[PDB]
Amino acid sequence: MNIFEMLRIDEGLRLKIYKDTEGYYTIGIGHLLTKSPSLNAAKSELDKAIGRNCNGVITKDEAEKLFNQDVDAAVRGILRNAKLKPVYDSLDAVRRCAAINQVFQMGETGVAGFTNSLRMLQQKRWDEAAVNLAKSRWYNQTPNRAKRVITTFRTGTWDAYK
Ligand SMILES: Cc1cccc(CN=[N+]=[N-])c1
């Protein structure tokens, strides 16, 4: 297991524009196109991202290319964030993957309310962190995925992904 295999499990792979769990137009491996309800605005973003007129459809190679870009930008983002970087750098490689996964799903603004979980993770209070992480909109809206990510934070193993 690694961050790519992990996010591939959590995000799936779809080659035609679809709506994610939040009802937002998305493609590939969880590549968010826009929060706009206009399918045409979504198609424009797609074409912009890929560099050709896609008419709502991409190839597996194209999906994987966006995925590489999206994972890279998630990591680089964490590193640029004064609140996130010290916690990230305190973690082992497996728990780092959990962090990338959560940021990928929620965004940096997404995790602004996780100050208390972040502190417990920095302290390596793993069970307490895991309890605190689940007290969230995130957990309630996507519990199956959040359970896997939280188990990864709790244990530093890949047990939840097999
Ligand atoms: C950068 C980073 C480190 C640890 C956890 C998370 C996800 N949000 N929380 N808690 C992000």
From Swiss-Prot:
Full protein name: Endolysin
Impact upon substituting S117V: 50-fold decrease in enzymatic activity
Lineage summary: Viruses, Duplodnaviria, Heunggongvirae, Uroviricota, Caudoviricetes
UniProt entry keywords in alphabetical sequence: Antimicrobial, Bacteriolytic enzyme, Cytolysis, Glycosidase, Host cell lysis by virus, Host cytoplasm, Hydrolase, Viral release from host cell
Effect of S117I: 500-fold decrease in enzymatic activity
Any one Gene Ontology molecular-function term assigned to this protein's record: lysozyme activity
UniProt note: pH dependence: Optimum pH is 7.3.
UniProt-annotated catalytic positions: E11 (proton donor/acceptor), D20 (proton donor/acceptor)
Alphabetized InterPro entries for the sequence: Endolysin_T4_type, Glyco_hydro_24, Lysozyme-like_dom_sf, Lysozyme_dom_sf, Phage_lysozyme-like, T4-type_lysozyme
UniProt induction comment: Expressed late in the viral replication.
Main location, first listed in the record: host cell
Effect noted on mutating N132I: 5-fold decrease in enzymatic activity
GO cellular component: host cell cytoplasm
Annotated positions binding substrate: L32, F104, S117, N132
Record EC number: 3.2.1.17
Annotated family: Belongs to the glycosyl hydrolase 24 family.
Effect annotated for changing D20C: Nearly no effet on specific enzymatic activity
GO biological process: one example: peptidoglycan catabolic process
Record annotation: effect of changing E11Q: Complete loss of activity
Subcellular location: Host cytoplasm
Result of altering E11N: Loss of 84% of enzymatic activity
Resulting phenotype, D20 to E/Q: Loss of 99% of enzymatic activity
Pfam families: Phage_lysozyme
Hydrolase keyword on record: yes
Gene3D superfamilies for this protein: 1.10.530.40
Domain of life: Viruses
